[model samples]
Target: KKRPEDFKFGKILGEGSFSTVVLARELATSREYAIKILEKRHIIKENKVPYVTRERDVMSRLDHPFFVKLYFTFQDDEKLYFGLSYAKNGELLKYIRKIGSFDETCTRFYTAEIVSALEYLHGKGIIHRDLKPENILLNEDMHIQITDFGTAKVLSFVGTAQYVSPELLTEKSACKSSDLWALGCIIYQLVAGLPPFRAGNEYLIFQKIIKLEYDFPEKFFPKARDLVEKLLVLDATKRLGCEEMEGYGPLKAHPFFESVTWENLHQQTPPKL
Candidate 1:
């Protein structure tokens, strides 16, 4: 029911090779939104029709609170516009940087919240291959919503290889376990302030990840370390939250999440930054 001219554009929220995620406000209702503007010519030039269509379908499939809500999609001759709920608080990376690292209690709550969203996506046969601090946005309430499904399961590389699994690097097909690799890195970063694998360049980063050469930083406790190690296994099938087996059962029951009650996680109080 809205046209491109109906909303006033503001600051850019994110940028991709062929798209820009901009802040928009409806001229009449005065409600704010984050709109992803894509170049139709670039998409067609690169034969990205199926991938973009899949991106749209994946976002529309998600309806959980921990996932970003897509409100509408409209296109003109030159571009396509995807209007989404504006997450006002900003990226999760900002909080991690300001605080240095999160306390264990805070980490537990945050990890639980992400698990809730991850499990839901897996159940729907989707993989959030793009799970990173930047892609995770916080609303005004300090709750996180996983956004940017543009590269969800496309299997092509994007910005960083820090969150990549060995299988993805080895040219193997991706599955639900592919996501938990990034989750482990995120959990490690939550308490340790940076990703587990790093080096002088992306090539060395890939080498370390492939060799399973990452080590824990000071803040990691025994249970936390155990959970991350399990998730970051070299063998994808051995990773925690294996889809063919018990799914998220084994992962949710890990000692690191001992205090979390998964069934009512959403209703539970979120940690304050």
Candidate 2:
């Protein structure tokens, strides 16, 4: 219930073909926010109304510490605007670049946060189709805040090719378990410095994913390997968390998180490196 003019814009956080996100601050409250502005002409030209609306609807209903919160939404004749919680440290990919691969402690800390967020989303019947390092942002505290719901869905096959579940390639559908597949790929990247499946071309990557043909390099920790194996199971129905009624029991009970204090995770300090 605010106008675009009600805020002062700063630097651009990001931009794409359809939208731009910028650092902004509310005039009245003087609160910082990340404002996303979408062009109506582009939306109409590309037939992206459904995607835009879905992003707004999904983000509005979400309220978790690990998920970016939508503060206000408004629209003008030519654009749609969303005021969102700002994460100042920027994308997790930057940190991943700083340290080629995370150590076990750092990996465990980040994965725990991601798993908690995914559990909350799945519990609400939401699926984050696009779950990658770039979509995860770091707050001032270095805690994670998942952003960019433009590709999220209730239960759909749409997702980034690298993180898409194997079943999604064949069945052309996705569910809560599909998120776990993406989480596995993320964890693998954090610890191993690469995605589970890789090839010279997109089609080759898809073929490898469909065939579930990823291997663990010798550097992969055995415990981490075990957890990844459970998550990246070729059979979607058989993947960990898919079989659990609450959708997170399997992940919470995994041996890899043996020392993780789930309730105190948010309060724990991430590794210094």
Candidate 3:
């Protein structure tokens, strides 16, 4: 057990309706952690949701490098706290806009890491449900670190659900295949500088996603477009990662991932910022 006074709090890392993520330095070890501080009162008032215990269990069971690391979970009489690893490099959305767009080389590295991350989650029978750039972060090494697991979905966070899938809209059932669509959306945004489906309102975006109303820019690379189309397919059963093809899924076998060295992917040097 530890007291809030046991650590020195620093700058904000992230903010949500019920909580704030902050960097806290442990006094004894001088180690740093990004701790999510949740207001129990606010959470209680808001239907006592969050399933924090369940999310915490999910966090504890997670053992992937690309998944955000967890350390401690603490609660006070007034609040709740979750100790998680630091991601100082910040959100993928920040650099995506900062650089205008990532070249294919950069996109290749990122999406590959994300695939590794997503695969691990599915392997554990979990659904991220939200896979937008905002949830994908960068570390000191500039590699992807996925954060904010099922909590965002619990809050009914919108926009990144812009990566919505056809079956998610029509069938009312979500599966691992649905996540691949969001991955494709992230990859498309990395290369094309915009989400495949672009519209002014949530309903319009949902319509576009359901109707598969998206286009590649003139400058968009063909390999990315090819992969994106396969991922965004309306039939969940027909989606690329749904089944084995050529003894591997579209992920490892896709042309867009030609340069990937999968055997030692995590050990490889990431692209520069």
Candidate 4:
């Protein structure tokens, strides 16, 4: 256990609605950790206990090479705390926006990892509504981990405005297939270098998504064009699904990801992070 007076707090990693992540060094071991501090009072007052608990539970069941490990979680009289491994590089969204474009190889790399994560989460009956790049973190090795479960509900809403599926547009709730749609959107961004559906008008954006009227810029990854096309499919029922135990799925058989070690990815090995 660490007392407030024991370790020195360093710079802030980031701040969220109910908590803040800070870099702190352990005085006893001289080790460092990313400490997430959450306000218990505010959480209780706002009836967010379930959300916090779900986040903790969801993170606990997770054990993937591409996902960050939760060292431990504890609660005190004042607040709740979760200790996590530090992500040295920070949010992958910043990196995505930096390059302004994505190549096919990079697309396959990120999409495969995220697909693996989604397969695991969906199997557990949990859905991550928010699937944008901002919710993804990359470590020094460029491996990825999906984060920010505050908006990640039990798949009860239309999900995020950008990555939402067409069927979810009219429906009040989303399903595992909806998560697959969002995964496709992320993969499309990875290979296409930008979002497939774009519009300043919300309705117009939904119209495009519902109609599946988007073009892919193939000059970036001509070889991966078919895979990008597969991801950009608008119909939720037709979207790709992963069967990690099946030993073969879209990710495993995708020509663009022929080099990926799908079995190894699902093994109990740490990511390059």
- What TM-score would each prediction reach against the true structure? 0.95, 0.95, 0.92, 0.83
The best candidate by lDDT is: 2
* Candidate 2 ranges with C-alpha deviation above 4 Å: 155-157, 244-246
Weakest ten-residue segment in model 4 by summed lDDT: 242-251
Tens-digit lDDT track of model 3 for 11-84: 99989877799999999999989999988788778764555655787888888788897788878898998899
List the pairs of residues colliding in candidate 3.
none
**lDDT of candidate 2?**
0.87
**What value of lDDT does candidate 4 attain over all alpha carbons?**
0.71
- Reference-based lDDT, residue 210, model 1: 91
True-structure lDDT of candidate 1: 0.86
Q: Which is the winner by lDDT between candidate 2 and candidate 3?
A: 2
RMSD of candidate 3 to the true fold? 2.5
Q: Write the per-residue lDDT of candidate 4 for residues 1-273, one digit (tens) a residue.
A: 656556678999999889998888878778787888899998998888888888888778777656667777766789887877778878876777788766655676677778778777776667787777877787656678777766565534455677877777776666666666777777667655577789988888889888887877636566466665665565545555733224227555777777777666544333321
Q: lDDT per model, in order?
A: 0.86, 0.87, 0.80, 0.71
Which pairs of residues clash in candidate 2, taking residues 3 or more apart in a chain or in different chains?
none
lDDT of 3: 0.80
Error of 3 at 136 (Å): 0.7
Candidate 2 lDDT by residue in tens digits, 1-273: 798788899999999879999999899999999999999999999988999899988998898889999988889999889888899999998888888998999888898999888878988888887889999999989899999998788653377789988777877887787788999899899889889899998899999998888998899878999999888888887777774534587678898899888887778887675
